[PDB]
């Protein structure tokens, strides 16, 4: 594993065997959907909405309690972002490293890490263009990449 490292950690979630769950959840699907929508109004990404719903509330899996997954819900309600969440966070990291590099020219493993992050950005963006989420000829051009993530 670890596309850009020699790590081999496994460390994931083990979601339950039950697809209908969990027999102590008395809340309604539409109630969870509206809580998802207002978190998306507050500018939370689907990962953050799912974390909040699991900790603060008893939402084990939004796709289980509701009918479908969180990014699908937000896209249904017009709350989809311009670029996917994971692509946004990779571009954000590349921008942060690049602004570290402009002030630290000797930081060569920062330069090495920036190459890894940008390689991860281009592979992801290539996927998203193939499944037609990003428009074709969408490109991370690395000079005005601060525009689309801030």
């Amino acid at each position: 594993g670890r596309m850009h490292s020699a790590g081999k950690g496994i460390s994931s979630s083990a979601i339950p065997y039950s697809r209908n769950a969990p027999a102590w959840f008395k809340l309604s699907s539409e109630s969870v959907i509206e809580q998802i929508v207002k978190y998306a109004r507050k500018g939370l990404t689907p990962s953050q909405i799912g974390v909040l719903l699991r900790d603060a509330h008893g939402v084990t899996q939004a796709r289980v309690i509701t009918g479908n997954k969180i990014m699908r819900i937000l896209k249904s309600n017009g709350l989809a972002p311009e670029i996917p969440e994971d692509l946004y966070y990779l571009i954000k990291k590349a921008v942060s490293v690049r602004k570290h590099l402009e002030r630290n020219r000797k930081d060569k493993d920062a330069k090495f890490r920036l190459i890894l992050i940008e390689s991860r950005i281009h592979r992801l963006a290539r996927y998203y263009r193939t499944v037609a989420v990003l428009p074709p000829n969408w490109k991370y051009e690395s000079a005005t990449a601060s525009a689309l993530v801030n």
């Binding site: 496994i10 083990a14 979601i15 065997y17 969990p22 102590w24 699991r54 900790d55 603060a56 008893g58």
Partner: protein, 81 residues
């Protein structure tokens, strides 16, 4: 051992194993109803929260995130499920 029931292992052996490495993988985590020092409103808290979960009456804290299970805030009571 050379002959053993791989379809029906002991519950002690399964409980010993990693969550991903049991016969059917599943979570070792749970959910808790937590009663705050102030009010008797039911709030459900994940075991391995990652959120500093707060309530309405004691709108500061119920659990503190850790590297694993969250720790309750020293003034609450809790029940599993």
């Amino acid at each position: 051992v050379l002959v053993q029931d791989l379809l029906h292992p002991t519950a002690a052996s399964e409980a010993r194993k990693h969550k991903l490495k049991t016969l059917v993988q599943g979570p070792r985590s749970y959910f808790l109803d937590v009663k705050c020092p102030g009010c008797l409103n039911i709030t459900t808290v994940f075991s391995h929260a990652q959120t500093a979960v707060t309530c309405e009456s004691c709108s500061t804290i119920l659990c503190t995130p850790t590297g694993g299970k969250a720790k309750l805030s020293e003034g609450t009571s809790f029940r599993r499920k």
